[PDB]
Design goal:
- By secondary structure, the protein is α+β, with helices and mostly antiparallel strands.
- Helix content is 26%, strand content 17%.
- The protein contains four helices and four strands.
- Strands 1-2-3-4 form a four-stranded antiparallel β-sheet.
- Residues 4-139 form the UBC core domain.
- One of its GO terms (cellular component) is cytoplasm.
Length: 139
């Protein structure tokens, strides 16, 4: 087993339970059963003063075998119009997101979500028209 990886992910799991950060993003395991700690769920409170306000975004984050040496994969479950996000799958294009494009082994799920929230408030995204609330790329 990958001790460094396993250890790091447990640290993140614990930080997600103590609400590290400003409380506007959260994360945890998707099924709390898989001890592989591969599939996580992310959450971002839409930033006030943007067209994302009053909405909560659900995302899926995957931390592969090479994590955290390699970046995790990310995708919105909640439909969103934002630079870097595919309009049919919700998949986040890593090269469109700095922390993913230039990933560093010191980053984390927390950092990815915090960066996504910052980008949400950025001039290029904050006034983008959004689809009807509650929509998801599935179900």
């Amino acid at each position: 087993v990958k001790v460094p990886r396993n250890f790091r992910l447990l640290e993140e799991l614990e930080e997600g339970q103590k609400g590290v950060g400003d409380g506007t993003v959260s994360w945890g395991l998707e099924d709390d059963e898989d001890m592989t700690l591969t599939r996580w769920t992310g959450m971002i409170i839409g930033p006030p003063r943007t067209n994302y306000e009053n909405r909560i975004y659900s995302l899926k984050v995957e931390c592969g075998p090479k994590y955290p040496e390699a970046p995790p994969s990310v995708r919105f479950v909640t439909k969103i119009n934002m630079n870097g996000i595919n309009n049919s799958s919700g998949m986040v294009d890593a090269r469109s997101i700095p922390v993913l494009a230039k990933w560093q082994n010191s980053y984390s799920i927390k950092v990815v979500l915090q960066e996504l929230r910052r980008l949400m408030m950025s001039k290029e995204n904050m006034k983008l028209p959004q689809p009807p609330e509650g929509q998801t790329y599935n179900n």
